[PDB]
DNA sequence: GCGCGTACGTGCGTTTAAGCGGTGCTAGAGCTGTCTACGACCAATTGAGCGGCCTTCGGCACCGGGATTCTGATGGGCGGCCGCGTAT
């Protein structure tokens, strides 16, 4: 389930919703919620340490 | 302020390559046309997430008890007080 299937530490089923409610393009590409959680986690980790 | 030094502006001549308009070629943008996959939407169920509320062990810095070391009144014995004092 999202983190699982994706294999990330970030919420994949949270940024998908905001990107569709922000109202960016007409519909949303399937690519992004998942990809978009990934880089975010990556940045998150780069600072903490 | 002043004074020394030199580098950077202004000139001419030499030189080098942009800009002009001439043609040719085909690549890659733009259009166009059909399919269908993927995202929005509506539904119903489920647990991740937020407020509300209070947890426990480890680490900084203040602490604890027991043997041991150093200071003080005590005391017999060898010496010195020279000055009042009794005896012949």
From Swiss-Prot:
The modification N6-(2-hydroxyisobutyryl)lysine is found at residue 21. Following DNA double-strand breaks (DSBs), it is ubiquitinated through 'Lys-63' linkage of ubiquitin moieties, leading to the recruitment of repair proteins to sites of DNA damage. H2AK119Ub and ionizing radiation-induced 'Lys-63'-linked ubiquitination are distinct events. It is found in: Nucleus; Chromosome. Core component of nucleosome. Nucleosomes wrap and compact DNA into chromatin, limiting DNA accessibility to the cellular machineries which require DNA as a template. Histones thereby play a central role in transcription regulation, DNA repair, DNA replication and chromosomal stability. DNA accessibility is regulated via a complex set of post-translational modifications of histones, also called histone code, and nucleosome remodeling. The nucleosome is a histone octamer containing two molecules each of H2A, H2B, H3 and H4 assembled in one H3-H4 heterotetramer and two H2A-H2B heterodimers. The octamer wraps approximately 147 bp of DNA. Belongs to the histone H2A family. This is Histone H2A type 1. It comes from Xenopus laevis (African clawed frog). The chain holds residues 17 to 65 of 130 of the full protein.
